[PDB]
Amino acid sequence: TINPTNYTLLKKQAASLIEDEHHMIAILSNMSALLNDNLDQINWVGFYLLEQNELILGPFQGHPACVHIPIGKGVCGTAVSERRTQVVADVHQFKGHIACDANSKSEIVVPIFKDDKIIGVLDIDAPITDRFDDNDKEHLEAIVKIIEKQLA
Amino acid sequence: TINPTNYTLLKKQAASLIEDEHHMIAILSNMSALLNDNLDQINWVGFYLLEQNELILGPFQGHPACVHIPIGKGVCGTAVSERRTQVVADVHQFKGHIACDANSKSEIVVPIFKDDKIIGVLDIDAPITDRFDDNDKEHLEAIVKIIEKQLA
């Protein structure tokens, strides 16, 4: 089982963490650590930023990952081409899935906006299937908005 | 107490990891993970970039950290002011120590160069004292130069 996540506390800590900060890289770096520290049963949490119609690896907590991700390619690429959050209960079910990371079994990708344009994504995967449900989706999207407010 | 570091292999792994890449944030993000996965007895490992006459937090592996570090302030800021690598056996004995981390006991900071100008620093601290010796210093500076080769 997955231990309950205290999102109310996490969201408050997120606001306080990046309050008065507007440097995107510094914000993304600290947020990856904050999420890593408060989410149970995850194995990789980080960000990808859009550059030249492709995602480029940004700050994250975990093992080294692939740097370039084409739009429409994989969970992250699809989150980008669709402009919508991707909640994957089992990565083996996602067509074009690109993540041979042995311990990557379920994932969630939330697009990040600024002036209605996608500027990157928050990517979190886990060592177990069905790690993220609709409840995690709601709160992680809300946390992304806390981040969006600082980059506005 | 400290597992020997296989620096010979690590330097091969560093070159292979960022081979054919030049994107600084992607390189720093992946290198923070590589070092975190191959160095024993450490509690934080990451980078700060020199922007607007101050160091600004960049990609790292660990808990959230302070975003802005004035030049000449703290081990990291002094690495910039003195323009030399700082190897601290006990941060508590460092002039005006700037850290609220209960598990930051020993530290090493290596300045990063591009066209002979400091553009950032590699910062690694450990939960024990005298964690970094001359051997570590030599090999970490060589690893930093491997990074500089891709940023050049």
Which tokens hold the place of B101? 């981390």
In order of A102, A125, B20, B113, the CA distances from A69 in angstroms are: 19, 16, 15, 29
What contacts B68, CB < 8 A, 6 or more positions away?
B54, B55, B56, B57
Asked if the Cβ–Cβ distance from A60 to B58 is below 8 Å, we say: no
Method by which the model was determined: X-ray
- The partner residue sitting opposite B58, judged by closest CB among A29, A37, A60, is A29
Q: How many residue contacts between A and B have a Cβ separation below 8 Å?
A: 69
Asked if the Cβ–Cβ distance from A58 to B59 is below 8 Å, we say: yes
Asked if the Cβ–Cβ distance from A23 to B56 is below 8 Å, we say: yes
Number of residues that this document lists for chain B: 152
Partners of B62 on chain A (C-beta within 8 Å) are: 33
In order of their start, the domains of chain A are 1-152 (3.30.450.40)
Count the neighbouring beta carbons within 10 Å of the beta carbon of residue A127: 15
Residue of B nearest to A22 (CA): B67
Three-class SS of chain A? CCCCCCHHHHHHHHHHHCCCCCCHHHHHHHHHHHHHHHCCCCCEEEEEEEECCEEEEEEEECCCCCCEEECCCHHHHHHHHHCCCEEECCHHHCCCCCCCCCCCCEEEEEEEEECCEEEEEEEEEECCCCCCCHHHHHHHHHHHHHHHHHHC
- Measured between alpha carbons, how far is A32 from A81 in angstroms, rounded to an integer? 23
Which tokens hold the place of B14? 């560093």
- The partner residue sitting opposite B29, judged by closest CB among A30, A37, A57, is A57
Residue of A nearest to B57 (CA): A26
Asked if the Cβ–Cβ distance from A65 to B30 is below 8 Å, we say: yes
- Measured between alpha carbons, how far is A40 from B24 in angstroms, rounded to an integer? 30
User: Do A55 and A71 contact (CB within 8 A), yes or no?
Assistant: yes
Partners of B58 on chain A (C-beta within 8 Å) are: 25-26, 29, 59
- Count CA atoms within 13 Å of residue B109 on its CB side: 25
Q: B5: which DSSP letter?
A: P
Partners of A21 on chain B (C-beta within 8 Å) are: 67
Partners of B21 on chain A (C-beta within 8 Å) are: 67
Partners of B33 on chain A (C-beta within 8 Å) are: 60, 62-65
Residue to test with chain B: of A10, A25, A60, A63, most B Cβ within 10 A: A25
